[PDB]
Design a protein around this ligand. Sequence first.
Ligand code: NA
Ligand code: NA
Lengths: 118, 118
Amino acid sequence: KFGELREISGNQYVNEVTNAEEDVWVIIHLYRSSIPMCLLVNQHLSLLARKFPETKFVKAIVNSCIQHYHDNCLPTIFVYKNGQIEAKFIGIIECGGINLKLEELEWKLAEVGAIQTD
Amino acid sequence: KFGELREISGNQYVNEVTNAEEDVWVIIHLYRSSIPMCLLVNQHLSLLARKFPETKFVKAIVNSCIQHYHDNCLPTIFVYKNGQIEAKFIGIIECGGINLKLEELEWKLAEVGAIQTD
Ligand code: NA
Ligand code: NA
């Protein structure tokens, strides 16, 4: 259905995330390449997108979404379904610390319902 | 408190509208200069801004808020309080027709609580 992690701009946010296909989970990562954790989080998300082609995976440089966003709120991951926020992970502690492995983020997104298999 | 109609970009939407000062009414006009009605609506909204300095009045070119936005949804006026949408006016018919005078926008914005003399 999907399968790959996608880069989007600020003005594509509403279309891709808030108005995403009905009943689809969207996982948007709000990021800055300047932050090592963001670089890492995207690594796992690229991989997780392929493993869960049913879930939508997008990412965006916060500067083109929300101006003057603070480093201490990064990384930011929001989980959406039907234009509603199902989960928020804001900052290092919530996104699961500076060391964060593939399977830990997988789990993180799982207990909240964002990704499933069959 | 405010007093003038102000131009914002897409990435200033979240800060200026969704996260606007608690209890403040925000009137955002999503527009394009190519559409006469929009030109006319900004005229009224500039004047109204000054008359109701308690209400926040902003305007923004949709192309930098939502990409691929359809002419037929213009003009778009959203009314916000505390990050929640109180009223939506989308397209010519709802923004009160091609002839639309200062006082009938005022009334329309007033009927739903956006502007006030106290
Ligand atoms: Na489900
Ligand atoms: Na009130």
